[PDB]
Design a protein around this ligand. Structure first.
Ligand code: HEM
Length: 457
């Protein structure tokens, strides 16, 4: 039962690269997985990886004593602006363990309670925007979610107000950031990056990094002009010592983590929120039940921390939006030693493996036959999901540090949304998923009718 591995078509020197020469590479990998099964080899010029789609292979991948986080090419290029921040550093880089030890406390339950007020502040700004639209007017979903989540990481993390709801155009940071990630996406499909032909692209990349470093500058400046102003994530970056050594972070690493958390703390959550709303409006029973639960639980003018915790059905909706379209759809791993996966595929020390999460999430042997159906009632019982069947937040010590932050935000927001408005899919919208690294619905528009429920000062 040692088997040889499936591969899609190669094309000489270009290997499998041409199969992923689209703006949607993940969705295309998904389609290759449907043809080829639970594992395929995937080559590009000098770099192999193997894409895994089934729970039974992925649970072995997720054994930490056999595999460790790999930087995929995407994360490798991303190092050019996020450096050795928590997302783009090797497990064995000194700064991974150090910053993880320093910053973990900032995502505890005490820290979540502390972030809560400022989460509401922004969420209230969202509702007010929507209350304030005229009759003829509609809502751009991903755009406002993006405004909401960026402002939330910024305020709760750093006490910096992007004021996205004061703007009709995306914030400068966003513009630069998307373009920097866009470049990152674009380099992945160049056969010859060397070619002098991409000259203002390389220059345009540098401009956008500098713009990100521009914003980071202001944040360390605004904080230099106060300090009492609050106690948050930035404080901990500046003042926290690594209990394992006594050392705090150095300034260079701190610029990296700030960039890392503004990026990773807004993009994925933003797509989760649009997806969830996409699914509510396509599925009347869920919409209705979410509204029933919001009305039942959100009894004070703004939500409390304890009240967001009580929104179980919203939790279920969120998990089922993440099942179907996990907004960070992939993470990379390499074998720490020669090892044999599912007793069928011998791997060499250093061989790379890719977890294809939307396929993992579509694994019939684990999830049942109705995997394409959006059915949040399948999450009624959380302990019934088998180990490593559900992984939108990655794996082990390298899993999402901001997981609770993300779910708390999206639960609160989605709850408030269904408390205050009815939603109409007035264009009968067709799902279109734009990929940067993360996933998000494109062109998703709705109309809200206000339930006209006052919203506390
Ligand atoms: C629902 C939204 C989110 C999703 C689906 C998501 C998903 C993920 C995934 C899949 C990973 C592992 C990546 C890998 O193994 O290469 C990760 C890591 C990480 N996430 Fe998130 N994330 C989300 C939101 C957030 C938020 C709100 C923050 C911060 C406020 C954040 C910060 C991080 C950090 C710092 C890491 C790297 C951890 C380490 O290796 O030490 N993420 N996330």
């Amino acid at each position: 039962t040692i088997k040889e591995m499936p591969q899609p078509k190669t094309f000489g020197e270009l290997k499998n690269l041409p199969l992923l020469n689209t703006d949607k590479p993940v969705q295309a990998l998904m389609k290759i997985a449907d043809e080829l099964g639970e594992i395929f080899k995937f080559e590009a010029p000098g770099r192999v990886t193997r894409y895994l789609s089934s729970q039974r292979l992925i649970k072995e991948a997720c054994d930490e004593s056999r595999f460790d986080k790999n930087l995929s090419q995407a994360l490798k290029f991303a190092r050019d602006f996020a450096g050795d921040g928590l997302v783009t550093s090797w497990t064995h880089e000194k700064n991974w363990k150090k910053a993880h030890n320093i910053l973990l406390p900032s995502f505890s339950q005490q820290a979540m309670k502390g972030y809560h007020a400022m989460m509401v502040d922004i969420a209230v700004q969202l509702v007010q925007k929507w209350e304030r639209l005229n009759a003829d007017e509609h809502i751009e979903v991903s755009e406002d979610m993006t405004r909401l989540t960026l402002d939330t990481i910024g305020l709760c993390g750093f006490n910096y107000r992007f004021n996205s709801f004061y703007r009709d155009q995306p914030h400068p940071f966003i513009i630069s950031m998307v373009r920097a990630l866009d470049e990152v996406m674009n380099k992945l499909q160049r056969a010859n990056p060397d070619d002098p032909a991409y000259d203002e692209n390389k220059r345009q990349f540098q401009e956008d990094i500098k713009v990100m470093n521009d914003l980071v500058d202001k944040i360390i400046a605004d904080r230099k002009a106060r300090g009492e102003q609050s106690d948050d994530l930035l404080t901990q970056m500046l003042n926290g010592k690594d209990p394992e050594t006594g050392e705090p972070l150095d300034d260079g690493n701190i610029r990296y983590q700030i960039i890392t958390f503004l990026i990773a703390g807004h993009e994925a959550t933003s797509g989760l929120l649009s997806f969830a709303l996409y699914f509510l409006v396509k599925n009347p029973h869920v919409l209705q039940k979410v509204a029933e639960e919001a009305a039942r639980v959100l009894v004070d003018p703004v939500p409390s921390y304890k009240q967001v915790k009580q929104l179980k059905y919203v939790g279920m909706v969120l998990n089922e939006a993440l099942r179907l379209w996990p907004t960070a759809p992939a993470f990379s791993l390499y074998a720490k030693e020669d090892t044999v996966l599912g007793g069928e595929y011998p791997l060499e020390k250093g061989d790379e493996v890719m977890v294809l999460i939307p396929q993992l999430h579509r694994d019939k042997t684990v999830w049942g036959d109705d995997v394409e159906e959006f059915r949040p009632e399948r999450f009624e019982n959380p302990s019934a999901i088998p180990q490593h069947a559900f992984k939108p937040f990655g794996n082990g010590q390298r899993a999402c540090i901001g997981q609770q932050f993300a779910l708390h935000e999206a639960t609160l927001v989605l709850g408030m949304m269904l408390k205050h408005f009815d939603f109409e899919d007035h264009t009968n919208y067709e799902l279109d998923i734009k990929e940067t690294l993360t996933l998000k619905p494109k062109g998703f528009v709705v109309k809200a009718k206000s339930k006209k429920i006052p919203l506390g000062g």
